[PDB]
C-alpha cells in the first residue's frame, strides 16, 4: 500500500544525456544511435533570440560549430540539420546505449516523467502531467533545455517531450521529438501567455479510486448522479466534461472497489462544493488531477520494467 | 523556476537490483561487487514468518537454497552470512556495473530517493522522508522487500534504506545496509505500532523559503518572534522545536531571499493559527515537510551526477 507519485526508472534515458555547445550556448542533447537531438536555439546568440530566423542562422553554422561533449568523450559532428524546432547532429559513433525506443506524441492530461539535465549530467527525476492547456509544471533552470520527457513500456522508451523554454506564469513549454511544439508556443523569447487551464476529471476520479484502494473512504457516500447531472457540477468547477470513455477507462477501478464510477463522481460532486472541511486524501488537502487511471492501476498493482 | 518533489536519477542503483529466491519467498536483493545483500527474512516460510528464530533458520540452509537472477542470468552463492536484518550472500561473479558506494545511516528528517523493485526489476523512483518515528511513507506492494534507499554526491550512491514490511497504518519499516532497523521494529509479523509523530519544523521553513524564491510570497509579513516565543507555538501545533543550528543551516536561504529566518517563522506560526483561506503554496494547500534545505538549495540551484 501507499500512494506517491512516482517516475519511471531512468537509467535507459541517462545513457542518452549529452552537452551540447555552440558559441555561448549550452544545453543539453539526446543521442539515439548516431544522431544527436536538442533544441534549436542553441544556434542562437542572446541578441538571436528575441526574434530569430533560424533556417538563415543554420546556413551560417558549420558542422564544427557544434561542440558535443559525451560525459569527457568529444562527439565529432559530421552532418546537421533541422527539422521543425529540434536539431538533428549526425555524429561519428552510434550510441552503444540506445535503448529500443520510439517517438510518441502525448495528449494532454496524460503523464510522463522528466528526466531534468543541466551540462549533459542528469539532476533528477520526477512525474508531469501535460495539462490541458499544453504547458507542464516542470521544475526547470537556465541550461536545462534537452531535457527529455518519456514512459516506458517493458524495455521500450516512448520519447514524448523536450523542454526549450519557460513561459512568465513559472509553467514550462516544449515540443516532441520530431519538433513540434505542445500548444500555441514558438521559440522566441516574446510575450506568450499559457492559455486557460482545467481540471483533468477523468484523473481525478482515478486518484480518488486510488484512495479508496489505500483505505481513504471518508468521502464516500450513498447517493448517485447522472453522468448528465454531474457534468453541469464539472462545468462550474472548472472541471472537463467527463465522457462514456472515460467511464469505460474507470471500469476497471469500479470493478477493483465496488463503486461505481457515477458514485465517485457523486462523491467528487460533494467535495467540490463542500470542501474538505480539514481532512487530507492520500496526504493531499486538494483534489489532485495528474495522476492517469494507468497510473494508478501501475501502482496499486506494482508493474515493472526491464 | 518550478518546485517538485525530486529523486536521484535510479540508473546506478538499477544495476544493482537481482531477484533472490528461496523456497516460496522471492524478494529483491543488492548486488554490490561479490556480494547480494537482502532482507533476512527471505529464509522464512510463511508459517515461518509469525515469530521466526533466524539463526536456527540459516543453519539449515544451504548456499544452493538461494536461487539469485541477475535480469536473465543466474548466479551462484558461494557462501551466505547473517549481519543482523541483512543477509550476505557471496557470489561467484563480482556486478561489474558496481557504482562507487558507502553505507550511510540517516538521521529522522532527512530525505532520499527509493527506487521501487519486484522481481529484481525497477518499477518506479520517487522521494522520501525518514519520519521522526524512524517510518517512511512509501508506496510498496507484496515483494518489494529489498528496494533501497539512496541518495548520490557526485559519483558515489550513499545507500541508506532497505525495505522489509509494512506498518498497520500503511507506513513502511526497514533498515540501513548493515541491517539494523530504523525505529523500533522487528522483522517478525506481529502487533507492532509506528509511534507518535512530529512535524518536521526546519523542512517546512525551508519549503517556504523554496516558495519565495518561486514567487509565493503572500504569507509574509512584517512581524518577527523570538526563537523562544515561535517554540512555545511549535510544541502546541505538533511541530519539533527549533534549534539554533536549524537557523545556521536556513542561513543561506536567509541571505539568498532577504528573509531572516525568525521573519519567516513568524510567517509560519501565523499560517499555523489561520490557516490558508483557501490558498495555496508551491501547489499545496498543506504545509509540507518532506524537503530539506539542501533539497530547496539544490533544486533552487539545479546541481547534477555523474
Ligand atoms: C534553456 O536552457 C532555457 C530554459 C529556461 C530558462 C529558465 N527556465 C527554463 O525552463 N530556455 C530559455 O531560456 C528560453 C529560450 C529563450 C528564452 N527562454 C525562456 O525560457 O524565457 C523565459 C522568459 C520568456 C519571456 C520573458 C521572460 C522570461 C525565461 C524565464 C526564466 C528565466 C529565463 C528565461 C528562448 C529561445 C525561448
Ligand atoms: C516483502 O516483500 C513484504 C513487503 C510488504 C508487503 C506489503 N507491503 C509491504 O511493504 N514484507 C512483508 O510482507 C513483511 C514480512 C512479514 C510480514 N510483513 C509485513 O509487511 O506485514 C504487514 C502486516 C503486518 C502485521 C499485520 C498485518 C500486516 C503487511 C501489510 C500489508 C500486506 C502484507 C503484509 C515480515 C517478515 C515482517
Redesign the interface.
Known amino acids: ?11 535507459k534515458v ?2 542518452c544525456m549529452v552537452q551540447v555547445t555552440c558559441g555561448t550556448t549550452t544545453l543539453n542533447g539526446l543521442w539515439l544511435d548516431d544522431v544527436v537531438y536538442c533544441p534549436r536555439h542553441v544556434i542562437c546568440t542572446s541578441e538571436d533570440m528575441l526574434n530569430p530566423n533560424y533556417e538563415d542562422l543554420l546556413i551560417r553554422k558549420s558542422n564544427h560549430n557544434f561542440l558535443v561533449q559525451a ?1 569527457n568523450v568529444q562527439l565529432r559532428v559530421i552532418g546537421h540539420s533541422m527539422q521543425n524546432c529540434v536539431l538533428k547532429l549526425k555524429v561519428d559513433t552510434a550510441n552503444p546505449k540506445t535503448p529500443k525506443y520510439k517517438f510518441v506524441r502525448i495528449q494532454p492530461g496524460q503523464t510522463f516523467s522528466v ?5 549533459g ?6 512525474q508531469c502531467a501535460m495539462r490541458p492547456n499544453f504547458t507542464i ?5 537556465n ?2 533545455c534537452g531535457s527529455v520527457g518519456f514512459n516506458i513500456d517493458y524495455d521500450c522508451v516512448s520519447f514524448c517531450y523536450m523542454h526549450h523554454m ?1 513561459l512568465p506564469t ?1 509553467v ?1 513549454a516544449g515540443t516532441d521529438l520530431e519538433g513540434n511544439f505542445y500548444g500555441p508556443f514558438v521559440d522566441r523569447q516574446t510575450a506568450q501567455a499559457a492559455g486557460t487551464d482545467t481540471t483533468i476529471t477523468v484523473n481525478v476520479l482515478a486518484w480518488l479510486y486510488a484512495a479508496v484502494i ?2 481513504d473512504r471518508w468521502f464516500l457516500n450513498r447517493f448517485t448522479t447522472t453522468l448528465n447531472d454531474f457534468n453541469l457540477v464539472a462545468m462550474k468547477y472548472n472541471y472537463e466534461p467527463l465522457t462514456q470513455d472515460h467511464v469505460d477507462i474507470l471500469g476497471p477501478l469500479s470493478a477493483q472497489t465496488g463503486i461505481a464510477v457515477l458514485d465517485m463522481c457523486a462523491s467528487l460532486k460533494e467535495l467540490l462544493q463542500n470542501g474538505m472541511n480539514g481532512r ?1 486524501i492520500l ?4 483534489l489532485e488531477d495528474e495522476f492517469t487511471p494507468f497510473d494508478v492501476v501501475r ?1 496499486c ?6
Chains 1, 2 share one sequence.
Open positions: 500500500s501507499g500512494f506517491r507519485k512516482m517516475a519511471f526508472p531512468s537509467g541517462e545513457g560525459g528526466l531534468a539535465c543541466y551540462n549530467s542528469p539532476s533528477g527525476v520526477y509544471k516542470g521544475s526547470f533552470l541550461g536545462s519557460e513559472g514550462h489505500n483505505g487530507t496526504g493531499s488537502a486538494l501502482q498493482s506494482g508493474v515493472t520494467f526491464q
